Amino acid sequence: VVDPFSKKDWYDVKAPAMFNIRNIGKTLVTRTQGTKIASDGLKGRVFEVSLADLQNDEVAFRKFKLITEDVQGKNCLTNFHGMDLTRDKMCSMVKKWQTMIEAHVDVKTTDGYLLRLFCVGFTKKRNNQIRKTSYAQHQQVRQIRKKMMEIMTREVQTNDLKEVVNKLIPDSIGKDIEKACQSIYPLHDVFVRKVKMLKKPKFELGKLMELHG
């Protein structure tokens, strides 16, 4: 009888200046009818956009979560909320005749942004190796897990989120873990397969407007 789309708006979401591409997409929201504010339906929004559509030229199988914190007008502002990996990549990384090492660390940054970083690692076969299994001892696995835990907890408490997100754009933490684990057992790839945001501090406006240039 009546199309609700006539009573609809359109807003463009923005990305923090710490990334290259500023626009992401356009979201349709019902017009402000009655006492229900339109901006109230703009806060809890999560975008599962890949980093390829958010950076000039980088890895395309990594994804990030962006949460909106404030909208000025006809233009919504976002913030970092998490990061995940492609499910196909994770499925293809877990293969046979190799040991997977997992480790979750609950470490807070300088400010009250508590994150639970996860890690995944595998062992492989040397170019002259004949043993098809190429497993690892339990103590070696424990030592590797401790090394990964220490490496991640060292590069979080010393700095704020604003530039450790930039640090997360490449696998700098992964490369550091890979280089630090050459002595126990040679791993090939270290990935932070999931990052959750457990706690956030009191909402602030100055930090938000500084984030968007």
Partner: protein, 136 residues
């Protein structure tokens, strides 16, 4: 009624979840946030036959209808997310996913990123049925 920006500047992006089981096909188009949608068209509305709910024809017709509505609104490009039944029963998408995707991409739409969002569990409860399984 139409797109908020010019039809020549860039492509307006929206995400579409295709849920396919061995007895139905679900096509759903929403905004990038996933909160507000556009329309929901499934093979259970097109063909009035339950035994033929999961078929390439029903999926094709539902995809054509949803693509026509999407073109009417003004959304140009779609990010497609496949999903099977998940839970604990099966992980293979139903027969309607292939035909639905081919139909909605042949309608004239543009397709971006593909991602599987099936709810595969690390460890679920006991599967339905007895110890000896479902024998027919």
């Amino acid at each position: 009624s139409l797109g908020p920006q010019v039809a020549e500047g860039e492509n307006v992006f929206g995400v579409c979840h295709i849920f396919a089981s061995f007895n139905d096909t679900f096509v759903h188009v929403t905004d990038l946030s996933g909160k507000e949608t556009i329309c929901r068209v499934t093979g259970g509305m097109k063909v009035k036959a339950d035994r033929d709910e999961s078929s390439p024809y029903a999926a094709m017709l539902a995809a054509q209808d949803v693509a026509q509505r999407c073109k009417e609104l003004g959304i140009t490009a779609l990010h497609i997310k496949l999903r099977a039944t998940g839970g604990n029963r099966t992980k293979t998408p139903g027969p309607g996913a292939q035909s639905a995707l081919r139909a909605l991409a042949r309608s004239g739409m543009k397709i971006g990123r593909i991602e599987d969002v099936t709810p595969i569990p690390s460890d679920s409860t006991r599967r339905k049925g007895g110890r000896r399984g479902r024998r027919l």
